Structure formats: structure tokens, C-alpha cells
Symmetry: D2
Subunit: 292 residues, 4 copies
């Protein structure tokens, strides 16, 4: 059983004054709230029990939007991160929620998309020992956790936001962990950036020979919605796919239905109040159409 | 003395689930909140005393964002519209705020842009009798209030969302009124579709020969953020201009400064807390650069 | 086994007027490189090195100027003219001598495919040695396309070209793999009510013989076509977003050639040289010393 | 009478490999060939007699697209620039075309748009002395000719592509000249950059107190299609305006009709060949719709 965490707080300075009114994670990516994207990622990984961590001010907003998850066949819980003191804090704030389980963390502003993403997630969720992370070729690796490989394609080092990156492979905001993660996190000291770093967690596993770094190929899209510009680009990306296909990306209701976490009667009840816009009409259609 | 009103309420059924967490009027248009755009419109019209009308739930959000307006040389007040029962309710809700003064109303999701907009506004503002409104050629006039002209260019008829529009000219969401508006609004009954219509207010002035209809030329951009797609397009539009020019659209701080409503010292105090991001850096730069 | 490829890159481009009064739709850019690069890349990724480019009489020399005989990219490119855009199936009549007694593949010039493991999706189809293979893709407006209907078991049961009342939301994309039966099939075709020699009629002949494989191309793949002004803009934006995020380029023939070992490192450095004053040349250079997984 | 020149040559290296296929000025901007835009600019300035200069290979292609211009009420002529040796060569190549007339040069890859652009053009075009150029605030002045002003608003220096710009005002790719330009261009020698510079022509006028630098306000769009990114952005801009308005930008047939250079019957005849598409349909619509 893997438990899931969505880390959806974080500093808002950058996006002010746009996000003076709204935390980044509540802004729409095209036609739905940003949080639906990472939420769908956990769902596609087969995870139904999820802890959403956000700021004292946004946590109540998330609860209002998403409730307890029961309408979607999920178990959502919530916790507050008082200060954005680092990704790895997720595992301290989430210690009691995780228990003795395996886990997965996804970042609030990370959007993934592509063919057979469900299988890629399935493959990582099924390795019960160590940790799995994903490496993606990017233009500006200095902005991210960076992973270096040897001549044989094997991962050999990690560095957080290196001044002189050793590769162009970023470690994306999606992480699968075994039961070792909490104690690793508990032992960390803040980096010089003043954060409790997920890269330090991932390095702990790498130093024990227990970090699986899978390449997320260039056929996938991995987008960061963290700037005004990237938020725009991501909206256009989603729009182009949805308008071409007549299918929506990261509709939790659809995913719950396809996974059999809710039945047709439940989906029909979710479509009603949204019946007057394209979203509800979309849900209704999924009841009478086979989609492969 | 002309007072301003921003009508910033409205139903969110359309934009759900994106606007399930945030109403249309608080969503960013690229890099700043939507309400900054119509606010800037009033400011460019020389209006400093402005009433913001929103939903019960949104008024405190607007208040948090904007305060009393004193930081920007403005006098901002707030009122609530309990149900989106028509644009003309603005004059009932704002009857006391208006007093015996002239007024202007702008719609919360309307974004205007172009060369000599400030002169177009000033001219309408200087007309102390009757009403003034603006007509703009559009592709789908059936979505809007539509104004018909005779062979000599005189406005002859108005119709709200006509099934068979008489022209391709939409009446935009920006209206200037004399003291007659409140009593005209007070005598209106709701339309078949159940709204107290701005088009009916406008028709009352037309039928007395006191409605001025100015053509807003194709050189201007008049956009609305009413839909997912149009918000995306409005974001791209603003981004292209800002990134080309190194100037921002609808920064209230800048407009206030340029209009002499706040001095250099006040502008510097506004920029400090935003100094870590591009918006604060922008305000500071405005103190040392002459922009024509 | 060798399969031979065909790009159908003709037509009038009427929907794109007046932009296509200047150039063939297939020479217009999609973001940073000519549209034709994209379908060409698709054939290359299917392991196909010998490719006939069919175009209008006026545009044929323009493609010859851009691409040449293909030898610098390790390919064998040839050209033939379609006098009038009288149907996709005409590709097999125009290309009959080119095809000879070989397996073939046709890709449409304004079709742009992208996604994870597309390379393997192409290789599975290209490596078959019998029947026809085509791809079904869920779309919003199936009435604009060849449409495939399935029974409750997932089996293809009918094909209709541009149906006013589509039987499903699955379009048959502009990518087709054929065995040696196709030329004789095409030869017996008559113009449809639309006035064309239809690929859909070709595909129905295979279906009738139980020899049509319809593979679903899932929603994780992007299949776009640049037929409208709007569509072409959106395709450019899509490529741009990917390229700017990744530091990698989509459908660079020089890269794909180098990766398939059809050209060597020295060959690539040579291609990069004349292009080095721009970002595209710089990227080719970077590929010589960067391992990309 | 002023005569016009469109410099539509150059290598277009920044656009490789797209411009291996085609001259940059033959590539579409959204819906019509790039060259329509600068052509429309000249036409909007009242100019009917225009010389189009391009490369040896492309000049014939422009002749094929546009012909002798008689069908649009113009007199279009062509000349080859053997090598892209500087904007000022347009005055040498075009020496005989110009004769003893006033002239104007517009760059092939520059796109202007905005309210009262026609009046802005008319003012400059109708002057009968000196040189007129336009200054536009930009984010990256180092890429352009840069004009500096004194405290009084008076232009005091010009630099081409300065590493350390003295201002954020670029001199755009539109230039109006009296009879002095040809002899000025004749005396120029190639710059450090290896080019016969328009900026050198402009400084010759500035030295004699005969350069009018007019500010093109932030209300106007001035874009150029020189990078892949900027060509994309220009296309989206045009698209947004065209789809909102149901009007098209830079349609030569329209402009010619509005200026009375062609009549209705002439216009019907031009739409006929284009009727099966949205562009022909638009021309037809112009015959029976009054557009203010
Ligand atoms: C630091 C911090 C962040 N966050 C949230 C905010 C965002 O949704 C998300 C990521 O924050 P950002 O600030 O975009 O990304 P950043 O924290 O610089 O980088 C992280 O995210 C990258 C992937 O996006 C990784 O490559 C880096 O290794 C990792 O450290 O996590 C929190 O909820 N709490 C925090 O304390
Ligand atoms: C099912 C579903 C998927 N997605 C997103 C998740 C992924 O980013 C992307 C693609 O979904 P995936 O299920 O990973 O892959 P997809 O291309 O649909 O491929 C599936 O469908 C193909 C066609 O039947 C099969 O041949 C593949 O074996 C199968 O994996 O779409 C959604 O946003 N919502 C969904 O309801
Ligand atoms: C009806 C109503 C609307 N609103 C807000 C929501 C939006 O910011 C703005 C406009 O409402 P919408 O419903 O987008 O636009 P719509 O109401 O269809 O039409 C209005 O706005 C159009 C232009 O935007 C005009 O051409 C029409 O004449 C006028 O009736 O007004 C309110 O705040 N309260 C309301 O009662
Ligand atoms: C007439 C015409 C114009 N344009 C371009 C030129 C400009 O970049 C932009 C706006 O055209 P202009 O004629 O400069 O300006 P516009 O905003 O239409 O304003 C005009 O129309 C207004 C409304 O009737 C008048 O109040 C103004 O006096 C008049 O100048 O559109 C075209 O691309 N094609 C056209 O046919
Ligand atoms: C009819 C015809 C087309 N062409 C070129 C033009 C384009 O690159 C490409 C496709 O032409 P279009 O007119 O977009 O596509 P269209 O003929 O409507 O539809 C075809 O392509 C669709 C996929 O794009 C399929 O779903 C249909 O079954 C198929 O008939 O083929 C030619 O070169 N010659 C032709 O005779
Ligand atoms: C190699 C290459 C690919 N492409 C396009 C074709 C596809 O649309 C898209 C993805 O390329 P593909 O090779 O199909 O798939 P990609 O996501 O890179 O996955 C590969 O790379 C993965 C990461 O190492 C491997 O796990 C996979 O087994 C392998 O198939 O990129 C290009 O445009 N140019 C190229 O040079
Ligand atoms: C040098 C040269 C250029 N051209 C064409 C190419 C373009 O359509 C147009 C401009 O060329 P570009 O090289 O993009 O623009 P660039 O030459 O960097 O700069 C010019 O254009 C800038 C405005 O776009 C100005 O601000 C500069 O003062 C001016 O020198 O002229 C020619 O046809 N022949 C030429 O010799
Ligand atoms: C001053 C200012 C303007 N704007 C918006 C309002 C308009 O949509 C657009 C253009 O502003 P306007 O002031 O109406 O027009 P603009 O093009 O700057 O033209 C001005 O500046 C020109 C150049 O000095 C003068 O020749 C004109 O007479 C003058 O009106 O920019 C802002 O968003 N922020 C601002 O601070």
C-alpha cells in the first residue's frame, strides 16, 4: 500500500501581485485548478489515500475545493506547513499519515503528460525497496535538482541547483519511497539555501545503492507551472490537446471512473451541477462512449 | 466630479471547475489580477473615487487585495451584489455612493488596450449631459449588446444578444452616465431572461436623444475574460506586449504616479515589498526612467 | 526487411489562403523548421530510408531544393509529380514503379505526430510483412476525417470518409503501412462521390479481406494537422513549448539520422558547420558531445 | 507623391532551417504572407508606387505573388540586392526608382498595429522635408538602433546595436526621407559590422538638425518576425485580433478599397478566386458591410 503526498504550499513572492489573491496552486491551468494535475498523477499511480500539505492560508482553500475526496473514491487528508522550509519537511509533517507504509510525493506545480505514463507510474509504484525518481532532459538544468550519469547510463551524483551542472537531466517533482524516507528526513540538516532538501533525501538512497533513476523520455511533457510565462505555456499545451482530442487532461472524476473507484451512478451525480458547462457535459459523455 | 463603479461579480457556473476556487475577477491575466485592468481603465479616465461591487464571498477578497485605495491615491469603497441579477443593479447597489454625481461603470472581465485610450476616456468623461458608450466591431455580435447604425453613422437601435443581430457592432462594458441613471435604473423591470439590463438603461437615453455612441476603432483591443479560451488569449496578448516593450499594462502604481496621485517617495515605499520580483523591480525602475 | 516510404505533400492548401499563394502548405514552418521535416522524420523513425516525395508540379522543385537527394542525411529521396490533387490513393499509382515489389508506407505531408515510444509504435507496424496497418485516434471533430467504427469487442467493423454523422469519435490518421497488395487495390479504384481516389476505400478493401490492422494511438500521443490557420499556429506553439523546455528539437533529420547510425559523427559535424551561426546548427554540434537517452 | 521601398531580402539565418525553404518575407504571419504587413503600412501612408527589393532567388517569387500591383490599384516594381550589405543600399539600388521624389523605406519583417496608425503615417508621409523616424520603448534595446533624448525630449544621439544602450528607445524599421537621402547613402562606408547602415543615414540628418524622431506610444504594437519565437508571437497577436473582431489586419484588397484605389466591382473580382475560403468570403463581406 502506497500513501501519497501533494506538496502544495511554497513561497508566493515571485508571482505577486498576481498570486496576491491566489496561491499559485489554485490558479487554473487552462480549464481546471492546477492541483488537479498532480492529484491525477497520484491517482494514475493507483494511490487513493492522499495527504495535501499547504500553507496556513491555502490549506482551507484546498479543503473547500476538494473536501474529503469521497465523491471521487479517495481519502484526502490535509496538513499545514507553517513556513516553506523545504520539500523534505513533507515527510516530517507527514510522518503519522505515512505510518509504516510506502509513499510517493508529487509537487503542486508539476504537470506530467504522455503516452503510457500510467505504466511508468505503475512500474515505480511496484518496486517495494529503495526509491524511484525520474530524470528529464531540460534546457536550464541549473534551476533544478540535477542527476549525473556515468558512461554506462548509471546515476552517479545529485546536486541541487548546481552553478555548473554536470548534465542536462533534471530530477522531476515526483518521488517514490520505501519506509526508510521518514528517518532519512528526520536526520537532515538545512542546506546552505536554508531548506530541508529532497535532493539530500534522494542522495541518501543513492549512497546506499538504493536509488532507481528512470529516464523520463523526451516524448513525455514535464512542465513546471511556477512562473507567469510557464503557466501560460502550460495552459496553451492543455488547450491544444483537449481541443484536438475531445478528451480532457487530469479530470479526477474520469480517472476515478476508469479505475472503478466510483461507478456510473456516482459519476452521473457528479456531472449534474456541472451540467451547464462543458465540464459536466464531458462527464456525462463518458457514460455513453467507449474510450480506448 | 465623476465617480466610478467596477462590477466585479457574476456567476461562475460557466468557468467551473477552475473558478470553483477563484472567481473570474481574481484570476491573473498573465502577470497581475484581472481587476487591475478595469481599475486602470477608471484611473485613466481621471476617476479616483471608485466603488467595487462583488459577490458576498468576494468582497473581503477584493478588500484584502486593494484596501482603501489610499496607497494609490484612490478612494475605494465596496458593496455587495447578492445575486447576479443584472448589470443595471449597479446603480441601485451604488445609489448612495453615487449621490448627485456623474458616473462611469466598467465590467470586471473587460480588458481595453490601445493608443490614445486615455484621450478617448477623457473625451467621454467631459460630456456632462446624457450617456456615452462605445461600439466595437466583433465576429459574434449575438454574444453582446448590439448597436445598429443608419446610413449616416447615427446609432438607431440597441438589442441585447439578438438572435438576428442587426450589425456587427457590440456595445462594450464601459459606460458613462449623467445624473439620470439611477432613476432610469430604478424604473426598470427584469428582461425575459431575468436580468436588469444595461442595454435597457442605454435604450432609455437613446430614446431621449441623449445617448452618445462612439466607435472604438479596430486599432484598439477590447477583450473579455469570460471563457477559458479567451482568458488564455488575453494572457498571451498582454505577455507579448509586455515582453516586447519592457513596460507593463495596467499597473495601478504606475498610473497613479504618472497622474501625480502619489509622489516618487510613495512609489518607492510601494516597490520595496515587491522588490524581489519583476513587478517591484519595475516600479523602482519607473523612478529613474523617463517613459514617454 | 526494407519498406519503402511515400510522403504525399501536394494539394492546393485552399483553407490557408492567402499564405499558401506564396508557398506549398508543406514548406511552411511549424515553429522552427519546414512542415515536411515532421512527416519525413516519422518515416525515418519507422526505419525507412528510401522515400518518394509527391507534390504538385509547381512545388516539386521547391522540395528538391530544400531536401536534395537525401544522401547527406543517409537517405535516398526521390520525387514525383501529382498533376491534380485527385486523391490520396493516387500515391500508389504515381509511385508504382518506385514501390516495385516491396512493402510500403504512406504519410501525409501536413500530419504531425509526437509522443513517448512513438518510435516503437512505428517499428511494430513497419516490421509486419502482411496486410495493412492504420492508426485510430480519438478526436473532437471526427466528421473531418476518415472514421473507424468498432464493435463491442474492439474490432474494426466499418470505415467512412468524412461522414456527416460519424459512427464514432475515432479518426484514421494520415499514416498507412501496406503489403504488396496495395498497388492492385489502388488500380481498381474509381473516384468517390467527393471526386477522389480515397485511401479509405483502400483500407476498406483490406478490412473486407480481414487483413486491416487498426491500432489505437492513445491520448498520450499528440496527432495534429496543420490544415487551418488556427491549427498551424497551435502546432507551432506545441513544438515551441516542448523544445524550449527540453533543450531538444522535434523532427531534426540530422539528429534522427545520426541516432540511427545512417550518418557518422564526422558527417554530422559537416552538416552542423553551415548552420552554426544559428541555434539549429549549435544544437547539431551539441549532439556530438552530449549523451541523450 | 512619396515613393515607397520594401526591403525584403536578407539571409534570414536566425530562422534556419525554416528559411532554407523560403525567404523570411514569404513565410506566413498567421494567415497571410509576411510581406502583406509592411506593404499595407506603405499603402496606409498613402503610397501607391513601391519598389520591392529582395535576393536574386526570391525577387521573382515576390513578382509571382504580387504582380505589378494593378489589381490592387498600385504600381509595384522589383529589384535585386545581390548581397545583404546593409539597409542603406536600398537607396542605391533604388536610386533610379526614387528619382527626385520623397521616399519611404519599410523593413520586410516589421509589423506595426494600432489605433490611429493611419494618421501617424499620414503626418510623416505628408511632411516635405527632412527625415522622420519612430522611437518605441523596448525591453532589449541592444538589438536595435537606439535613440537617446535630452532632459527636454530632444533627440541627441543614435547608436546601432549598442552593447550599453543609452536609452530603452529603439528606432523602428520605418523611415521617411526627403531628397537628401540618396546622396547621403552614396557617401556612406561600411560599418564595423560590415554594413551600409540606416543608422548612419539617420545620424547625417540629426547632425543637420533635420531628423524628426516621433515617439510611437506604448499603445501601438511594433513587432518583428526575426526569431522563431517572435514570428510565433506575432502570429498569435494577429490571430487574437482577427478572431475577436471579424476584421483582418493588412489585407491589401481591403486597404485599396477603403482608399478608393479600386472600386466595388474590382473588389468583387478579386474575391471570386478566393471565395472557397475565409479570406475570399471576407472580401465579399466588405462589399455590403459598412466598417467604421
Ligand atoms: C520549498 C517548498 C516548496 N513547496 C512547493 C512549491 C511548489 O509547488 C513546489 C516546488 O517548489 P519550487 O520552489 O517550484 O521548486 P524548487 O523547490 O526550487 O525545486 C524543487 O522542485 C524541482 C521540481 O519542480 C526539483 O528539481 C528540485 O530538486 C526541488 O528542490 O513545492 C512547498 O510546498 N514547500 C516548500 O517548503
Ligand atoms: C486515462 C487517462 C489518462 N490521462 C492522461 C495520463 C497520461 O499523461 C496520458 C495518457 O494516458 P496513459 O493511459 O498513460 O496512455 P495512453 O496513451 O492512453 O495509452 C493507453 O491507451 C492505448 C490505446 O488503447 C494503449 O495501447 C496503451 O497500452 C495504454 O497505456 O493521458 C488523463 O489525463 N485522464 C485519463 O482519464
Ligand atoms: C450579469 C452580471 C454580470 N456581472 C459581471 C460578470 C462579468 O465581469 C461582467 C459581464 O457579465 P457577462 O455575463 O460576461 O457578459 P454579458 O453579461 O453576457 O453581457 C454584458 O457585457 C457585454 C460586454 O462584456 C455587453 O455587450 C452586454 O451588453 C452586457 O449585457 O459582469 C456582475 O458582476 N453582476 C451581474 O449581475
Ligand atoms: C482601415 C484598415 C486599418 N488597418 C490597420 C491599421 C492600424 O494598424 C489599425 C487601425 O486602423 P486606423 O485607421 O489607424 O485606426 P482605427 O483604430 O481604425 O481608427 C479609425 O476609426 C475610428 C473609428 O471610426 C476613428 O474614430 C478614427 O479617427 C480612425 O482613425 O488597423 C488594416 O490592417 N486594414 C484596414 O483596412
Ligand atoms: C487529396 C490530396 C491530399 N494531398 C495532401 C494534402 C495534405 O498534406 C494531405 C492531406 O490532405 P487534407 O485535404 O488535409 O486531408 P483530407 O484529404 O481531408 O483527409 C485525409 O487525411 C486525413 C488525415 O489527415 C484522413 O483522416 C482522411 O481519411 C484522408 O482522406 O494530403 C495531396 O498531396 N494530394 C491529394 O490528392
Ligand atoms: C530520438 C528522437 C525522437 N523524436 C521524437 C519521436 C517521438 O515523437 C518522440 C519520443 O521519441 P521516442 O524514441 O519514440 O520515445 P522516448 O519518449 O524518447 O522514449 C525513448 O527513450 C526512453 C528514455 O531513455 C526509453 O525508456 C524508451 O524505451 C525509448 O522509446 O520524440 C524526435 O523528434 N527526434 C529524435 O531524435
Ligand atoms: C541588412 C539587410 C536586411 N534586409 C532585410 C531583412 C529584414 O526584413 C530587414 C531588417 O533586417 P534585420 O537584419 O532583421 O534587422 P537589423 O538589420 O538587425 O536592424 C535594422 O532593423 C531594426 C528594426 O527592425 C533597427 O532598429 C536597426 O536600426 C536596423 O539596422 O531588412 C535586407 O533586405 N537587406 C539587407 O542588406
Ligand atoms: C500611461 C499608461 C498607459 N497604459 C495603457 C493605456 C492604453 O491602453 C495604452 C496606451 O496609453 P495611452 O496613454 O492612451 O496612449 P499612448 O500610446 O501611451 O500615447 C501617448 O504617448 C504618445 C507618445 O508620447 C503621445 O504621442 C500620445 O499623445 C499619448 O497619448 O497603455 C497603461 O497600462 N499604463 C500606463 O501607465
Amino acid at each position: 500500500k502506497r500513501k501519497g503526498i501533494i506538496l502544495a504550499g511554497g513561497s508566493g513572492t515571485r508571482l505577486h501581485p498576481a498570486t496576491l489573491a491566489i496561491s499559485k496552486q489554485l490558479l487554473p491551468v487552462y480549464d481546471k485548478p492546477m492541483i488537479y494535475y498532480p492529484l491525477s498523477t497520484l491517482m494514475l499511480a493507483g494511490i487513493r489515500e492522499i495527504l495535501i500539505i499547504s500553507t496556513p492560508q491555502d490549506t482551507p482553500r484546498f479543503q473547500q475545493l476538494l473536501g474529503d475526496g469521497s465523491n471521487w473514491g479517495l481519502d484526502l487528508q490535509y496538513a499545514v506547513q507553517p513556513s516553506p522550509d523545504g520539500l523534505a519537511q513533507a515527510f516530517l509533517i507527514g510522518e503519522s499519515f505515512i505510518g509504516n507504509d510506502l509513499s510517493a510525493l508529487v509537487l503542486g506545480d508539476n504537470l506530467y503528460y504522455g503516452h503510457d505514463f500510467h505504466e511508468l507510474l505503475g512500474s515505480a509504484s511496484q518496486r517495494q525497496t529503495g526509491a524511484s525518481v525520474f530524470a528529464y532532459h531540460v534546457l536550464d538544468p541549473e534551476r533544478y535538482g540535477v542527476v549525473e550519469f556515468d558512461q554506462g547510463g548509471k546515476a552517479i551524483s545529485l546536486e541541487e541547483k548546481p552553478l555548473e551542472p554536470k548534465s542536462n537531466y533534471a530530477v522531476t517533482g515526483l518521488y517514490f519511497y520505501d519506509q526508510q524516507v521518514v528517518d532519512i528526513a528526520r536526520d537532515l540538516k538545512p542546506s546552505p539555501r536554508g531548506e530541508l532538501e529532497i535532493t539530500d533525501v534522494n542522495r541518501a538512497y543513492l549512497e546506499r545503492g538504493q536509488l532507481s533513476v528512470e529516464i523520463m523520455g523526451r516524448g513525455y511533457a514535464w512542465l513546471d507551472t511556477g512562473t507567469h510565462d510557464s503557466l501560460l505555456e502550460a495552459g496553451q499545451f492543455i488547450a491544444t490537446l483537449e481541443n484536438r482530442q475531445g478528451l480532457k487532461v487530469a479530470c479526477p472524476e474520469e480517472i476515478a471512473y476508469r479505475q472503478k473507484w466510483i461507478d456510473a451512478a456516482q459519476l452521473e451525480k457528479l456531472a449534474a451541477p456541472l451540467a451547464k458547462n462543458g465540464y459536466g457535459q464531458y462527464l456525462k459523455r463518458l457514460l455513453t462512449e467507449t474510450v480506448y
